[PDB]
């Protein structure tokens, strides 16, 4: 049975040390990737560092670098990362983990806390690009990293070569001009614009909007183009 | 009819100046909100500058604070933005544009562009969080900011108080144990995890991941929560 068990994590000051250890079992160690992932409270995955089966290559993103070294030490099936200069930032459940760059197996991981003793709304949108037939349904998604009212999510659209439109104020209240065919809904975090049915005109980028506080923030776009 | 027509723009130096002029007509200048959006070339909209109708309040982004300067003539409808310290990153085509914080109007916009004489791919979902019922379809929605084949775009789940675990190493390939209600399609920049029929244990977090190159980075999460 593959085991991946982490140790040596706890409280630490800013600038501190601390030094990581994964023991693994159940596995030719020497024939394996080795890695650390990370997950800061209440936040999304990163990857850490990684270290081929001999040590002949060592990986590292660039918020590490040149401040974490990985180690592995094969004669004891284990894997090391020595963090030095820590900040606030490295905060998370540091995961032992195999192989690279995908993780089949994850240890339980270890909590690291580096403490002395808001933010703008993000909008994403989805898909990137959609392929469709005249006449056909258009389903856009955007996504607000934080909560709005859907009184204050408005839709873009800009065709290609021309200045962007205003589409929607905010809900599904639409500028003049704009038909009906373009209803907007969603309230909180996930807001949608249909296009009921596809004229040729409609193929274009469109443009999600938050104009709740300062800065008003764009999503970055979804393109709508024909199949 | 309203007519917003902008001026000024061309090619500068970095570090030098630069002063926009739009032009209003068709509606009283002085009711109403004016303000200045760009658009890189080939990305997306940044509001960069707004002010109120009496000129009693400023607005600016932050990545242009301390360096650019909006004011107003009511007296002759005309809307200004003073540009200095510009940087390559300011290049872009600027749209004048009515009111704020959501743009009704916009003029067909100016040049500029700030000249001497690859990055890593970013990985959104959609949406933030799915509300579904036990037996229901779920539908889950990644986007590379850059392009991705099948055979690099992993998928992951985290069940409540666990750690990650691997779902599908790339195009709906499956790890060991997870079961076939999970599959995953997509090509290029626009992926979806399909969980035909929603277990009570299948109502967790769940993150895709590219491993085409290094960092191999994760998207920042769906919650398939009950409804």
């Known amino acids: 049975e593959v085991q991946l068990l982490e140790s040596g994590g706890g409280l630490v000051q800013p600038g501190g040390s601390l030094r990581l250890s994964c023991?693994?079992?159940?596995?030719?160690?020497?024939?394996?990737?080795?890695?650390?992932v990370r997950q800061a409270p209440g936040k999304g995955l990163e990857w850490?560092?990684?270290?081929?089966?001999?040590?002949?290559?060592?990986?590292?993103?660039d918020s590490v670098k040149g401040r974490f070294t990985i180690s592995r030490d094969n004669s004891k099936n284990t894997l090391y990362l020595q963090m030095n200069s820590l900040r606030a930032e490295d905060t998370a459940v540091?995961?032992?983990?195999?192989?690279?760059?995908?993780?089949?197996?994850?240890?339980?991981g270890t909590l690291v806390t580096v403490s002395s003793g808001a933010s703008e709304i993000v909008l994403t949108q989805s898909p990137g690009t959609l392929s469709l037939s005249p006449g056909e349904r258009a389903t856009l998604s955007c996504r607000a990293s934080?909560?709005?009212?859907?009184?204050?999510l408005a839709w873009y659209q800009q065709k290609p070569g021309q200045a962007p439109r205003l589409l929607i104020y905010?809900?599904?209240s639409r500028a003049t001009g704009i038909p009906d065919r373009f209803s907007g809904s969603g309230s909180g975090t996930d807001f949608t614009l249909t296009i009921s049915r596809l004229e040729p005109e409609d193929f274009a980028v469109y443009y999600c909007?938050?104009?709740?506080?300062?800065?008003?923030?764009f999503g970055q776009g979804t393109k709508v183009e024909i199949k | 009819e309203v007519q917003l027509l902008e001026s000024g723009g061309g090619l500068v130096q970095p570090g030098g100046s630069l002063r926009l002029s739009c032009a209003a007509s068709?509606?009283?200048?002085?009711?109403?909100?004016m303000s200045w959006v760009r658009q890189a070339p080939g990305k997306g909209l940044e509001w960069v500058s707004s002010?109120?109708?009496?000129?009693?309040?400023?607005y600016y982004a932050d990545s242009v604070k301390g360096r650019f300067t909006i004011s107003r003539d009511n007296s002759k409808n005309t809307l200004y933005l003073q540009m200095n310290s510009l940087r390559a990153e300011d290049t872009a085509v600027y749209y004048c544009?009515?009111?704020?914080?959501?743009?009704?109007?916009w003029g067909q916009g100016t040049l500029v562009t700030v000249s001497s004489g690859a990055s890593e791919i970013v990985l959104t979902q959609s949406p933030g969080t799915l509300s579904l019922s036990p037996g229901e379809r779920a539908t889950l929605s990644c986007?590379?900011?850059?392009?991705?084949?099948?055979?690099?775009?992993?998928?992951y789940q985290q069940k409540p108080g666990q750690a990650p675990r691997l779902?599908?190493?790339?195009?709906?390939?499956?790890?060991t144990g997870i079961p076939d209600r999970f599959s995953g399609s997509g090509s290029g920049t626009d992926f979806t995890l399909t969980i035909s029929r929603l277990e009570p244990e299948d109502f967790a977090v769940?993150?895709?991941?590219?491993?085409?190159?290094?960092?191999?980075?994760?998207?920042?999460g769906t919650k398939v929560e009950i409804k």
């Open positions: 544009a009515k009111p704020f914080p959501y743009f009704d109007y």
């Open positions: 909007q938050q104009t709740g506080r300062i800065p008003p923030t």
């Open positions: 068709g509606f009283t200048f002085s009711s109403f909100s």
């Open positions: 905010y809900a599904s």
């Open positions: 934080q909560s709005v009212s859907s009184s204050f």
């Open positions: 002010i109120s109708g009496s000129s009693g309040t400023t």
